[PDB]
Amino acid sequence: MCGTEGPNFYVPFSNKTGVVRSPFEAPQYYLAEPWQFSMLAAYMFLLIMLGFPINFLTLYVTVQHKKLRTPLNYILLNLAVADLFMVFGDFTTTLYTSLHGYFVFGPTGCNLEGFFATLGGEIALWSLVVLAIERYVVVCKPMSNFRFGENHAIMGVAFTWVMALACAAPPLVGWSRYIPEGMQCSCGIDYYTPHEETNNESFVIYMFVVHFIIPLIVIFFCYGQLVFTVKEAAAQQQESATTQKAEKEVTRMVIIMVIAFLICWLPYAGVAFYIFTHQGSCFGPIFMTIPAFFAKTSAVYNPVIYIMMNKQFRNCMVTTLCCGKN
Amino acid sequence: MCGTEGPNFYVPFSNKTGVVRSPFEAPQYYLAEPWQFSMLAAYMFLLIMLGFPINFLTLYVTVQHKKLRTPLNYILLNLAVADLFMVFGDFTTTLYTSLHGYFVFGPTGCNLEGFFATLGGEIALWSLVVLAIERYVVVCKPMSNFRFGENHAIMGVAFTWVMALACAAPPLVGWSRYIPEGMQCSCGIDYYTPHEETNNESFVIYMFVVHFIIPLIVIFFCYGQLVFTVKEAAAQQQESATTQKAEKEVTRMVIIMVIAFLICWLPYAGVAFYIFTHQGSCFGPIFMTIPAFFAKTSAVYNPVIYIMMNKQFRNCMVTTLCCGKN
Ligand SMILES: *[C@@H]1O[C@H](CO)[C@@H](O[C@@H]2O[C@H](CO)[C@@H](O[C@@H]3O[C@H](CO)[C@@H](O)[C@H](O[C@H]4O[C@H](CO)[C@@H](O)[C@H](O)[C@@H]4O)[C@@H]3O)[C@H](O)[C@H]2NC(C)=O)[C@H](O)[C@H]1NC(C)=O
Ligand SMILES: *[C@@H]1O[C@H](CO)[C@@H](O[C@@H]2O[C@H](CO)[C@@H](O[C@@H]3O[C@H](CO)[C@@H](O)[C@H](O[C@H]4O[C@H](CO)[C@@H](O)[C@H](O)[C@@H]4O)[C@@H]3O)[C@H](O)[C@H]2NC(C)=O)[C@H](O)[C@H]1NC(C)=O
């Protein structure tokens, strides 16, 4: 028996020595050295310092450039706000609590911080999904005589909110639950503990399917079709060298988008799966931190991929940074 | 009497309570809370995470692009290596010692770490100086029938090394000295203490003049003349719109370069001056950290200004990041 448990938590450490305390009450420095708690904080510092400017800039530059506000960009803006929730509801809090060596906000603080930290990265997730669907619709033109417009773009955004609530809201009401995780400075969904009172098991499956498999499939299909439609067109168009460039560009970019999605969600998926099927086994606090390290950083690399590498967004950004010129 | 002193150090705190320990021996958590030591470490993390890629990339991209290696770029490469010394000899060490709450490497560790941390930012300093001189020489053509070439560029680089040793080497031999500074996790020149055995006073003046005033003057003169020569040419050339752009660009860039130089060196200068003329007065550990916060970060913003905003370097960089294309 690998850890110690209580009404609202599970500490990944054995109380055989009597040292273990509530992660809501005293420091966890038996889980990890304090410098490791600092490093956790250092990381949380990095992600704020990078995540905030680049995501906030996105909103800001949109306000400055009329060229940018187009129904197809609505979802990208959604991404940037979602990333901000991640930045404030998650990274900063965790910067704060890590520096105490435990989650100082108690169980309600855990529900809140967990809800927003989940709501943030889930909106971001479904945004990447919705974007792919639209680009598929717009570029592949699967349904004839359909022009994508502002009203569709709204639903696409609202869809992310519904889907993200369909994930983050249930633990607040008793399907799974939020508990401190890893080094116990941050709160997340309990996918690793078979807590029957909240039916944690049925939820992790529902998560694995609806919030992982569905996204992975949609994202592959949609972009799959795209790299098809575009490679097709170029082969029928070879007298055009620009067109040849375009097909090249798009492919590369989709490879990046697809790889990026995996780097973000694979570890959380691989780990959740492994634990589910390895149930008798002991999983340390740091290791539990790893798939989180991966997903959290997406709040930096997503807008670099999806915004900064965008021709339109970058120029407006470069213009604004340089105070109106260039 | 504001602090406590010992053979190799000065702690900015009063031993009237008997709590003060050697910064080479035990934690300084009476100087500042531990979370503040973490934050110091977080900052040191930021500067490595940003400072290393962008400075190392510079060296690397030069290796990949023949277009870049030109005598006028030698000094820029010097800048990037100097910034690296700052990154490894300073930021990482300080990341390490901060996490102990004192300088764990003892006085010899203090001499080393101080020497390299000084040598780094001083090479960087004189690089910005040398660059300005060359650009003045090349653009203003003050001396007729002179073409700048590889051999001049070498001396320019070597000059930075001589000048930086003319600064960093004396404290190792008894003109001033290296002691832990601020929160006592890092070592620097002792400009704040009137330690007569090493003649700290005559050195801070020599520093203030030779390593601050001289740089400030040269940098203003040289770039002053440049924004003159270029504004002159455009006024005589107005039928050319490109030329009009150029004069605009250069001016803006010099404003940035000049402002940047001040942001880096003004606080260290203002503080050193104030302390010199305010000698009876007490200066806290954190405040002593401030002008260092400013100068250290230049290891990030200098190569952004001087390298990434360079048309030539950026493109090669953008090419290399994207794995040969675009
Ligand atoms: C991990 O292990 C440690 C050790 O098992 C455990 O800490 C212990 O918790 C109990 C509470 O359940 C503490 O017991 C108290 O001890 C003090 C005496 O110093 C008293 O204040 C308390 O007495 C009251 O309660 C007793 C019965 O529960 C009655 O006998 C008495 O009349 C009072 O009503 C009580 O004995 C105990 O001190 C700690 N021990 C240590 C070493 O901290 C901890 O709870 C575990 N962690 C987790 C995560 O569950
Ligand atoms: C800031 O203040 C504190 C308090 O003033 C100061 O720490 C003290 O340093 C002295 C050493 O100079 C320590 O004295 C030792 O105490 C222990 C007893 O616990 C003994 O090991 C030592 O005895 C030897 O030395 C004595 C004379 O120096 C002889 O009488 C004896 O025979 C032995 O030779 C010695 O007394 C003292 O314990 C600490 N006190 C505290 C509270 O830590 C500290 O040095 C100051 N910091 C700085 C930066 O200078």
Ligand SMILES: CCCCCCCCO[C@@H]1O[C@H](CO)[C@@H](O)[C@H](O)[C@H]1O
């Ligand atoms: C940058 C934001 C910094 C926020 C405050 C960090 C405060 C850490 O606070 C410290 O936590 C310790 C337990 O670990 C307590 O014992 C100390 O009394 C408490 O001061």
Ligand SMILES: CCCCCCCCO[C@@H]1O[C@H](CO)[C@@H](O)[C@H](O)[C@H]1O
């Ligand atoms: C990322 C690099 C982390 C390097 C190691 C940091 C080690 C901090 O180490 C700790 O310092 C304490 C005093 O402050 C000592 O009391 C502890 O015993 C020691 O483990």
Ligand SMILES: *C(=O)CCCCCCCCCCCCCCC
């Ligand atoms: C060849 O095609 C290599 C191409 C792709 C490079 C894509 C880089 C995206 C980087 C996003 C930001 C990542 C780091 C975030 C750190 C917190």
Ligand SMILES: *C(=O)CCCCCCCCCCCCCCC
């Ligand atoms: C109008 O001209 C505003 C123009 C200048 C912006 C120049 C920005 C340079 C930034 C360099 C890197 C700074 C941050 C380093 C953080 C560690």
